[PDB]
Amino acid sequence: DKHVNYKVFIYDHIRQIAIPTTNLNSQSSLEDIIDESTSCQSVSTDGSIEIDGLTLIHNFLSESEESKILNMIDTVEWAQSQSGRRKQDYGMPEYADMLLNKMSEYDVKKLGNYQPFEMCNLEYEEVKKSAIEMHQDDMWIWGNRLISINLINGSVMTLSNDNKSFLCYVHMPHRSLLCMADECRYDWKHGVLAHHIRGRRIALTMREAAKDF
């Protein structure tokens, strides 16, 4: 753990702020996150922070929508990625248009006007011990908003801030959408630890370019 002596926060999806907690650590179990995530509303705002650009929307997809998408996903072949992951590189998929619209309908200001260069499905699997390390995309090549939709199972998106030694867990439930922009995009690195994966999960990624080139 690089985050062993970090200050750990939990994201309150209702108040849309990160509360510090002593009940979590850098090696917290997936259950610990969920219990703290649902119990942090009554906790004090003392020491809390606001992470501008972090947008979690519960139940972004319905079960019909998800089922339709998952069936279309599995027709296409899976490539090999790193750290026990697989991928499908796309823009091309028919279900992209739908997702872009729903994103605009919920919020035209933030999630509208979105033309991503890449749309990528990232398959996780508990048995492979799939994961993605803490990292950040360069602002000179990659743009503002990073979308991620939780298919099959939810998980936890771990955020870090090295300059301030802040660790933050965002519980992403089944069929939730996480948009990462602004501060969250540019001042925080993001990752998903192996012990936060429940069975199989497919993260439906999107990302826009910084420039047309």
Residue numbers in the entry: 33 to 122, 140 to 262
From the paper:
Here, we showed three complex structures of 6mA demethylase C. elegans NMAD-1A, a canonical isoform of NMAD-1 (F09F7.7). C. elegans NMAD-1A protein has 291 residues involving an N-terminal extension (NTE), a nucleotide-recognition lid (NRL), a DSBH domain, and the CTD. Like other AlkB family proteins, NMAD-1A requires the binding of the cosubstrate α-KG and ferrous iron for catalysis.
At first, we obtained a structure of the WT construct NMAD-1A (residues 21–263) missing the CTD at the resolution of 2.7 Å after extensive screening of protein constructs and crystallization trials. Surprisingly, the active center in this structure was distorted as reflected by the flipping of Asp-186 away from the active site, indicating the importance of the CTD. Additionally, the Met-188 of NMAD-1A took a significant conformational change in the presence of SO42− and was very conserved among sequence alignments of NMAD-1A orthologs. The CTD-deleted construct NMAD-1A1-263 decreased the demethylation activity sharply. To obtain a structure with a typical active site’s conformation, we used full-length NMAD-1A or certain NMAD-1A constructs containing the CTD for additional crystal screening. However, all experiments to obtain crystals suitable for X-ray diffraction failed.
